[PDB]
Amino acid sequence: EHLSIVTLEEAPFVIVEDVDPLSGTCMRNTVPCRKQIRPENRTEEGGNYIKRCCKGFCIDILKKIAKTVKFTYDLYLVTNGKHGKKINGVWNGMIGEVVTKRAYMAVGSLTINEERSEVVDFSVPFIETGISVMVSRSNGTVAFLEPFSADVWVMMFVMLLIVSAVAVFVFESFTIGKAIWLLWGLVFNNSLPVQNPKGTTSKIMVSVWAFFAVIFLASYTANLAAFMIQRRYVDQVSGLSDKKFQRPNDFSPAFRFGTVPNGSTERNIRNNYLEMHSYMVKFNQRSVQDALLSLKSGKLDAFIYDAAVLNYMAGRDEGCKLVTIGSGKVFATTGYGIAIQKDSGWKRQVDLAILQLFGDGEMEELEALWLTGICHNEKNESQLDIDNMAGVFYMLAAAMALSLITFIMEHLFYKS
Amino acid sequence: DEHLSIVTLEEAPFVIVEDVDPLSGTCMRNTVPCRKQIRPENRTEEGGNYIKRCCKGFCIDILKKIAKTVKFTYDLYLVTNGKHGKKINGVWNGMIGEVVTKRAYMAVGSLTINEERSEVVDFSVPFIETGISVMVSRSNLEPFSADVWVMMFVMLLIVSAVAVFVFEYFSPVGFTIGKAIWLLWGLVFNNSLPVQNPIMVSVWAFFAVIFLASYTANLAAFMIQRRYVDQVSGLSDKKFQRPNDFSPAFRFGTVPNGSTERNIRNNYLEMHSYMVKFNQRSVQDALLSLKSGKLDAFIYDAAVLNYMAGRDEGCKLVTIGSGKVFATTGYGIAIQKDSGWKRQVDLAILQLFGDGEMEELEALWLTGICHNEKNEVMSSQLDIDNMAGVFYMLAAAMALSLITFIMEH
Amino acid sequence: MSTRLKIVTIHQEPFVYVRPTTSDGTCREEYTINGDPIKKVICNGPDETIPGRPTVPQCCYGFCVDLLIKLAREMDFTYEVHLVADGKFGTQERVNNSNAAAWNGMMGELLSGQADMIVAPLTINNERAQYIEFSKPFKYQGLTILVKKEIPRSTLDSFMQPFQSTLWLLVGLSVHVVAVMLYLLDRFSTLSSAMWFSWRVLLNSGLGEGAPRSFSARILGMVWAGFAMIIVASYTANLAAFLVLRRPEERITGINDPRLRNPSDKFIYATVKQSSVDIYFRRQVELSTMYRHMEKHNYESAAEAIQAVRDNKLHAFIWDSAVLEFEASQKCDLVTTGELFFRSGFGIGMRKDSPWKQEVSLNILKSHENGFMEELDKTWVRYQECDSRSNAPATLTFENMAGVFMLVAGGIVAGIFLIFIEIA
Amino acid sequence: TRLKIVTIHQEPFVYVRPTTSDGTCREEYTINGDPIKKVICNGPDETIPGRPTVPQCCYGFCVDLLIKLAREMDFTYEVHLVADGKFGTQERVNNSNAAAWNGMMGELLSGQADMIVAPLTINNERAQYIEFSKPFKYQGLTILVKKEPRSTLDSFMQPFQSTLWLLVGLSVHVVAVMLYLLDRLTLSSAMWFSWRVLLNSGLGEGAPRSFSARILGMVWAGFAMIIVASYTANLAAFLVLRRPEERITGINDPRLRNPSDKFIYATVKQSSVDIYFRRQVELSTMYRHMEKHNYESAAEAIQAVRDNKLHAFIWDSAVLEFEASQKCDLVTTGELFFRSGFGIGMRKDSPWKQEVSLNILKSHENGFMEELDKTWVRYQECDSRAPATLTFENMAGVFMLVAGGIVAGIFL
Ligand SMILES: CC(C)CCC[C@@H](C)[C@H]1CC[C@H]2[C@@H]3CC=C4C[C@@H](OC(=O)CCC(=O)O)CC[C@]4(C)[C@H]3CC[C@]12C
Ligand SMILES: C[C@]12N[C@H](Cc3ccccc31)c1ccccc12
Ligand SMILES: CC(=O)N[C@@H]1[C@@H](O)[C@H](O)[C@@H](CO)O[C@H]1O
Ligand SMILES: CC(=O)N[C@@H]1[C@@H](O)[C@H](O)[C@@H](CO)O[C@H]1O
Ligand SMILES: CC(=O)N[C@@H]1[C@@H](O)[C@H](O)[C@@H](CO)O[C@H]1O
Ligand SMILES: N[C@@H](CCC(=O)O)C(=O)O
Ligand SMILES: N[C@@H](CCC(=O)O)C(=O)O
Ligand SMILES: N[C@@H](CCC(=O)O)C(=O)O
Known about the structure:
- The complex is a heterotetramer, with 2 copies of chain A and 2 copies of chain C.
- Chain A is an alpha+beta fold.
- Chain A has a domain at 2-132 and 337-359: Periplasmic binding protein-like II (D-Maltodextrin-Binding Protein, domain 2), CATH 3.40.190.10.
- Chain A is built from 15 helices and 12 strands.
- In chain A, a hairpin with a 2-residue loop joins strand 6 and strand 7 (90-91).
- In chain C, helix 4 packs across helix 5 (191-202).
- Chain C has 3 domains: 1-140 and 345-388, Periplasmic binding protein-like II (D-Maltodextrin-Binding Protein, domain 2, 3-Layer(aba) Sandwich), CATH 3.40.190.10; 141-154 and 250-344, D-Maltodextrin-Binding Protein, domain 2, CATH 3.40.190; 155-249 and 389-424, no CATH class.
- Chain C has helices at 63-74, 106-111, 126-129, 165-185, 191-202, 215-241, 258-261, 276-283, 288-297, 302-310, 321-328, 356-369, 372-380, 398-423, and strands at residues 5-9, 17-19, 31-32, 36-37, 41-46, 55-61, 79-83, 91-93, 102-104, 117-118, 132-134, 139-140, 143-148, 269-270, 316-320, 334-341, 345-346, 349-351.
- The longest helix of chain C is centred in the middle third of the chain and has 27 residues, at 215-241.
- Chain C is built from 14 helices and 18 strands.
- In chain C, the strands form 7 sheets. In chain C, strands 14-15-13-16 form a 4-stranded mixed beta sheet.
- Chains in contact: A-B, A-C, A-D, B-C, B-D, C-D.
- Chains B and C meet through helix 4, helix 5, helix 6, helix 8 and helix 12 of B and helix 3, helix 4, helix 5, helix 6 and helix 12 of C.
- The site of one 2-acetamido-2-deoxy-beta-D-glucopyranose has 5 residues of chain A, from loops.
């Protein structure tokens, strides 16, 4: 039961790797899969077909299904690139090859729409996918010094000095220097080892400074709790707020939405919003990586794309600047499915195989091994980060090395 | 230079009625004289003698100004019949009833402009916005969590065992463990310990940073509760449309034969039938019903409620919905129908709007000591009951500590 | 029964939207935020995209168009709506004639016969009322000043904003009741040493010179130290509690703010030229100073001044309250600052000798009592207001800190005078 | 012609309430401002213990989808509630050689019904007997529970991560050692100075007079006010809008795997969620705890989870998240697992399956399911909080950290 299957290449659903030239054959997960090039060639103007090894998620589904229903397979790739678009009544791509009978089954990154469901049949959904938009947010947030203002330094130091200068003389075995270290120590939440004054008048002014201590302390406690109690939020409007699919302008100078021309998402946006069809056809992209670079280099505000492929990408992003608008919003709600022959086919038993892969929990194990991303794998990652402590320690350590500069300057002035 | 008799009602702060100054035997300050024909009885008359009083207010001032810009004489008269306007058996009674009855050529006061009224009488431009509004007084000291006293005493016992575990230097008595329990306990209560300890004091200091951080952080927790949120916000909420729902029922009512009664009757028949049984008497009495729990919420005119909340002592009763106003109608001087100074009075009102003198008028009358607060709702400006509870703990533990002093004596 | 009457309107954004026509000539079918069909009419107005000022049809929709249709239902009349030629509201002026003045704008065309009724957010005022008759207003509004959302300043107040004057007297009464009580409780029944003991325990001064050791005075001093950590915890607690739910200081504290009266060239404000506010500041002589500044900085369109407020080009923009509040509910970069003034009302305009004024004003009163205008408010004041905005106080503001610092410095200086008081 | 429609009472999708005294369904309008569409359902009124059939008024998401599908194809319908009140299962009660189905499945196989328009989940065990369309609801499995308290641990290391606290100590020895070096018994004076400055012990033991050492100690005391202001800052921030607890087990959690009688997690009896833990032999142990503590109706489990009777409740993500958005006393488990989909069910030989399923594929393409979502899954917000009295357990936690440090100090 040699069953030839046609597929397209889109990671991580179908990873294509050249055969190991030392082993000749394919190693580990990968199953043999050919690929033929019309434009250039070695012999017979293209007659030679290159050999490759195909491994991945959907490829593991096709090989595992091939082990469960006992149907053998010689995998084959598509020459004309497409997903499920049909032009002038003629379909091309994976669903096009499914309608052209060149493949009994078609497993890959093929979306299930009504136009394909009318001419070919599909199986049970494997992964939930639809139309979605992706945009990047800058990690521009910025720290404990932020609480107190710049008036803290000039005002506080000035008042201290003036008060120890004035207050010391309102204060008027041994006498040890000036008690300004006692005042500044009192400002930093008591913890003052200095000896207080023995006079009667100094018992008043110091008390006043104590006020100026605690209040300042309170400010250093209030305002450090003020700027730090404003985080973890997003206020971009939901529910098609940009209206760019119908009215491209918005509260922003421009909204750019690109679709893959002659694709399922473009045809679905072409049949949904005709304004999105005109502006999407004018802003039609080449590949997915070009649109991703357009979203990373500020060349595109957003993109309109398959949802699952963008959902696995969140893990992929490093420093996770990128994210999926809506915290996981899905618009179309359709699913992936292996194509079968119309009307007639093994469809029922194959569907039993798919839902059996779901019943054994292989979708959870595959999502944990493949889908799961170091990023967001942890539940959500309230706790003071290292950035704030870096902000404080930059000033504490800066005052430490600057204190050593006060020691070297104290030596330059001490040698005189 | 015309008669233009005016009928009015008494409604603060718009028309305040004060007795004549006996020493002045005349209307004090900038008051205008206003009489009242007491018809049913008199010392020696039967509907012919009228008592004298002195009316002054916001509407009185606007009447004086309009009368200055438009040359006409007038003598202020109170309304004997009903009050305001109301229509019974197709016969008009009240201020509008006396204006259409030709018993008064003009009617200036806290009178609303409504369609049914504008059928029989004319109205000028509106000078103050006034509609229906809702107002409710929300019917609904540290987080010790049964641990302040028990953890302070157990912290004193751990201070005693730790004091015996220190074993350093030289101490006065064989007391000193209680001096390190008052020094360690005091240090647990945010430093302030003058006893130089000989570490156990370092452990109690860690308990001061962590435990004190919990006391201040949770003290900021219980106070971070956003308040002033109205119990019923929309006035289209279910609490108003269906009263027999939440137990106990939300008692609310209004004042009869006003604008709100006729518009509420012509708008909702069922809600009118439900609210007619719980109708209140006076405005101040309805404020008491909104304060004494006899009425959860209260709804009535907007402007009079705006001042009544602005001058309300303590600013307890506030408008539901942060100042939401339905209906949208407005007041105006009621002139004679069909004919009258229809355009000249309006022109006077609009030129008086051009000079901008209202702002000063509202500053003199409308602005209260409640709208003069900071631009923030401020939550609770200062603890008067919560701080008095902590003072009741310090004074109660001060008399009880005095009982431990006499018992110690 | 027809009585086809021309109708003139202006482009004020909430009330009258004016957008272009679709390739077929019809209006783009749009859905009301509530989930309903949006209304639509055609307007013969000035083309703002072309030099010629040519008349081009457009699709106009919003509050004033919907109210226009409701009135076209309640009364049996027909209409043809178009935007005004000069593009501005009504005002009186004399450009070429030194002895005769005339109206220009909607007011003009209404008097010129080019229109028979104007329905827009027309301000109601004395100058216009002498030539045109207004209805009982369909919109009750005023004037607010718009500003860009600048650095979040702090709500100015003295250092005692957390505790009123009534509670502090009781707190101090307890302070001297426990310091004098500490003077009586010490040694089981010195005074200055006792005040220094209780105060040193309340302020954590820790001098240690005087300190009662009695278990009644040390346990009462432990309830005193706990009252110090709890009282200080309450002070920092509420002091941090005002921090949220704070109203950032409004830039202009009303029309009579320090920067508002004095026309300093650092803060530039203006309003729409040939508009109601121009008659307001042009008639009022006292505001002439302000008017002077505005005389040189006013704009032709109101939107231009809006974007000027957004583009940091223009500092403040005094205008109608409904338009500015709506733009504040649309753009988060704009706020309206300070107390309202000149509270007027948009009402339908028509010539004084028109009997439509009576039934039309009455039907406006009905549409108020019918609750219809509220529905129009939910539809065209979407109130997609930017909310949950959080105050960010400046780490500190010299003011609100110069009050406490001024009290402490004042305490010192006076305290030298008090040292001179102890000298005598 | 006329075909029968079977449905079950599911809270968000199929409301089943009786009519007024007249007999017609009460006309109402949703919060959106739209007339709620209702139809007639002839099923067992649970109000009467009798299990007697009585026609009623039914309305919801699946009702709107049923009217929509009745509009797509040129057919009429006759809706009726399921007789037994359960979803359906396969069993052989009285015949040891012949098996049958019960529930809506039984009425469908016995011919009593022609179509099921309820939140019916697609799976392989049911796919052997009926044919399903493209799913109309994307959902999964989440453990639903009603969760209680601010502190589960000592509050000194909660606001500042381990790197921040360890950094604070590293600065303690950087200022103690840098103060011993800049000011050049003595080591104990440096450690006692830095520690006494960070903890406000106030010993007054010693002090250096060098400007380098005084500036170092001033940076250490100010930095101490900033680190105690950060610990009290972020420690006070976790007072409102605190992060949820781990009671939400997720796909791979210990609470979902271990069957303890104190943390009652269970599934609805005579439903699929019982088969999820009954088939797997590994969960057989848990199955034991599920065999003796299972509930019949999902609403009873919802009330048990609201009345603090059932700790967790594993159920579909659509219904559990809906009840979490309606009754905020309950929350679903993170890491959504067992993602399935509700779809309509038909018989094999029916031709409708070709068109109707395609219609569903078209029904998603036009965005009608998005409007149905805007109508029938609306999240009612709740009290954003607050904790109030709930501070004892933490305070015992931090006090346990201090007392534990006193024990380890006694060992030293
Ligand atoms: C669906 C078709 C057949 C129209 C139904 C025709 C009748 C069955 C009519 C006659 C009087 C109507 C009713 C008139 C009173 C109410 C209004 C409304 O009920 C309420 O307003 C709630 C307050 C209350 O229950 O009194 C909706 C149902 C009902 C009973 C109406 C329902 C239908 C009724 C009974
Ligand atoms: C001095 C202080 N000690 C405890 C906790 C704390 C936290 C951060 C800074 C300061 C303080 C306290 C409670 C109330 C006021 C001030 C403080
Ligand atoms: C993925 C992609 O860009 N595919 C395009 C297709 O959309 C287009 O219709 C065709 C016309 O030449 O060229 C292909 O390369
Ligand atoms: C406070 C009160 O009930 N006043 C009513 C008044 O509204 C009514 O108009 C009048 C008779 O019509 O009877 C009075 O008692
Ligand atoms: C319901 C309603 O207010 N209808 C009004 C009526 O009150 C008014 O008297 C009349 C003008 O004569 O115009 C109708 O439209
Ligand atoms: N003056 C109002 C009374 C009700 C109100 O003040 O709104 C009237 O004429 O009916
Ligand atoms: N009568 C008030 C109304 C305030 C308001 O609009 O809410 C005033 O004119 O000042
Ligand atoms: N911004 C909307 C306003 C109308 C509405 O959605 O209600 C528009 O221009 O269509």
